[PDB]
Design a protein around this ligand. Structure first.
Ligand SMILES: *[C@@H]1O[C@H](CO)[C@@H](O[C@@H]2O[C@H](CO)[C@@H](O)[C@H](O)[C@H]2NC(C)=O)[C@H](O)[C@H]1NC(C)=O
Ligand SMILES: *[C@@H]1O[C@H](CO)[C@@H](O[C@@H]2O[C@H](CO)[C@@H](O)[C@H](O)[C@H]2NC(C)=O)[C@H](O)[C@H]1NC(C)=O
Ligand SMILES: *[C@@H]1O[C@H](CO)[C@@H](O[C@@H]2O[C@H](CO)[C@@H](O)[C@H](O)[C@H]2NC(C)=O)[C@H](O)[C@H]1NC(C)=O
Ligand SMILES: *[C@@H]1O[C@H](CO)[C@@H](O[C@@H]2O[C@H](CO)[C@@H](O)[C@H](O)[C@H]2NC(C)=O)[C@H](O)[C@H]1NC(C)=O
Ligand SMILES: *[C@@H]1O[C@H](CO)[C@@H](O[C@@H]2O[C@H](CO)[C@@H](O)[C@H](O)[C@H]2NC(C)=O)[C@H](O)[C@H]1NC(C)=O
Ligand code: NAG
Ligand code: NAG
Lengths: 50, 170, 50, 99, 49
């Protein structure tokens, strides 16, 4: 299929209407960030030659 | 298509696998880059039919319904001014999809300010949004409301000069 | 077949036709010795960085 | 930068070869339409909100903070005066209570 | 798939290590990929090649 970018939304804009939130949601979201790799070393001489 | 060359190439191990893997990683990373830049909102916003934004004029940055690609004049100017086993993979997002994402971002920031970036899009008149932004830099609201037509004229002139400067400087 | 390492008793159940064992790197991991048919575990003696 | 919504605080969690952040955010909910004005005209003076925004629930005009509906009587304490009513485009007429 | 980024880092590092280890089994146009066989089979002027 041709993917949808998102659900269509029409904001009811006018020059004298404002939307004020009467409530709130305390949301917690996760963010995963890699920090380090495995510290590896290679013995070049013994890798190439044994 | 040389069979003897390929027979010799099998003696070199998985170099080809490494190169294809690295290029595939780059290829998926490009799409990831485009997603992270543009696909920041999951609601596709549209501008209202009536372009009454308190004198502010966004025609140069809003999409042109006359064009088949639905690009803005500035976007169309940008696209006009930028011109053996190898395959070019098309990007995941087409130019039309990136234009729709940019259009959604523009519609959200015009009709709702910064509210659509932190949750549900909250409609607000544009001179009042710009008065909030004036508050955000330490300038009181009355400085904006008493000079609203002048600020709108300066904004429109600056947008037009941006279009001209892009068009005239290679 | 030439190699360097320690020769120990092995608990790897070889098949009767199977004579030597294999790892990823193709350096020999186990063998069945001649004259005895006994299966020896081959591990290269300790290395590391100084 | 610290999650979707208005950031409140974050909590780090150690992970194998990485870090996980628990971003606590304030996400507004249950929005309600209102009629708004840029300023309130009172005795030939223009009143602008000091911290909030002028809203109307249909009959009365209040001032509320922008991120949470909390209507209050438009007073001289929570509004500041600047100029007259002849300059601001869209100003509406309402009384400003004085304590 | 929540921890996909760390798992991707681990998989790429392990896979690169495994590919590096597997490259020791390629002869690169020589007679054998084992140095001991080349040493025990050939005279030095060809063993050097
Ligand atoms: C504020 O009022 C407008 C209309 O005056 C509402 O917009 C309508 O919303 C419904 C439901 O999403 C749509 O079916 C209509 O097409 C919208 N009309 C217009 C003109 O946009 C809006 O939802 C109201 N907002 C709140 C929070 O009640
Ligand atoms: C604001 O929203 C919260 C939830 O996001 C509402 O709390 C709920 O209230 C209903 C009815 O009182 C209960 O059945 C739910 O169990 C409550 N949920 C939670 C998580 O506590 C709250 O009532 C709303 N407040 C207003 C003024 O609308
Ligand atoms: C917003 O700006 C655009 C362009 O800056 C205005 O479009 C111009 O309209 C006049 C008369 O209608 C034409 O002579 C120009 O050729 C138009 N310019 C272009 C580039 O097409 C537009 O009128 C402005 N106002 C509104 C409300 O859209
Ligand atoms: C707008 O809000 C005001 C204040 O909350 C409302 O005025 C009150 O309405 C109740 C209705 O029973 C009366 O008992 C109070 O005496 C009113 N207060 C004052 C100071 O007059 C008003 O009704 C609201 N309007 C709408 C359309 O919701
Ligand atoms: C807000 O109040 C002012 C002053 O009471 C109104 O201005 C008057 O408007 C009438 C109607 O045209 C004129 O006859 C008066 O001369 C005006 N007086 C002044 C001092 O300007 C104004 O019309 C009111 N606005 C609204 C929307 O009701
Ligand atoms: C000698 O080696 C042969 C394998 O060639 C084996 O079958 C036989 O048992 C061995 N004999 C002794 C006495 O080790
Ligand atoms: C909004 O625009 C209408 C015309 O469409 C006008 O009558 C009204 O005064 C305007 N309101 C504000 C607050 O600018």
């Amino acid at each position: 299929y041709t993917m949808s970018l998102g659900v269509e939304n029409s904001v009811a804009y006018s020059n004298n209407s404002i939307a004020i939130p009467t409530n709130f949601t305390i949301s917690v979201t996760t963010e995963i960030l890699p920090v380090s790799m495995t510290k590896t070393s290679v013995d070049c001489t013994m890798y190439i030659c044994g | 298509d040389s069979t003897e060359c390929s027979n010799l190439l099998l003696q070199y191990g998985s170099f080809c696998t490494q190169l294809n893997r690295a290029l595939t990683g780059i290829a998926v990373e490009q799409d990831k880059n485009t997603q992270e830049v543009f696909a920041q909102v999951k609601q596709i916003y549209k501008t209202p039919p009536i372009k009454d934004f308190g004198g502010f004029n966004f025609s140069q940055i809003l999409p042109d319904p006359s064009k088949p690609s639905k690009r803005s004049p500035i976007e169309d100017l940008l696209f006009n001014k930028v011109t053996n086993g190898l395959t070019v993979l098309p990007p995941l997002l087409t130019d039309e999809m990136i234009a729709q994402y940019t259009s959604a971002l523009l519609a959200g920031t015009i009709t709702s300010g910064w509210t659509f970036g932190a949750g549900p899009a909250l409609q607000i008149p544009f001179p009042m949004q710009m008065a909030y932004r004036f508050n955000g830099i330490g300038v009181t609201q009355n400085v904006l409301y008493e000079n609203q037509k002048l600020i709108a004229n300066q904004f429109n002139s600056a947008i037009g000069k941006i279009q001209d400067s892009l068009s005239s400087t290679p | 077949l030439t190699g360097t390492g320690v020769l120990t008793e092995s608990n790897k159940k070889f098949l009767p036709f199977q004579q030597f064992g294999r790892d990823i790197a193709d350096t020999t991991d186990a063998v069945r010795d001649p004259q005895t048919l006994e299966i020896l575990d081959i591990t290269p003696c300790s290395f590391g960085g100084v | 930068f610290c999650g979707k919504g208005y950031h409140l605080m974050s909590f780090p969690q150690s992970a194998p070869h990485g870090v996980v952040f628990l971003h606590v955010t304030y996400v507004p909910a249950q929005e309600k339409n209102f009629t708004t004005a840029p300023a309130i005209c009172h005795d030939g003076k223009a009143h602008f909100p000091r911290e909030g925004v002028f809203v109307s629930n249909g009959t009365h005009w209040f001032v509320t903070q922008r991120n949470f509906y909390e209507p209050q009587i438009i007073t001289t304490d929570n509004t500041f005066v600047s100029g007259n009513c002849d300059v601001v485009i869209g100003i509406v007429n309402n009384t400003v209570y004085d304590p | 798939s929540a921890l996909g980024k760390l798992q991707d880092v681990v998989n790429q590092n392990a896979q690169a290590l495994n590919t590096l280890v597997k490259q020791l089994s390629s002869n690169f146009g020589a007679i054998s990929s084992v140095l001991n066989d080349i040493l025990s089979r050939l005279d030095p002027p060809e063993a050097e090649v």
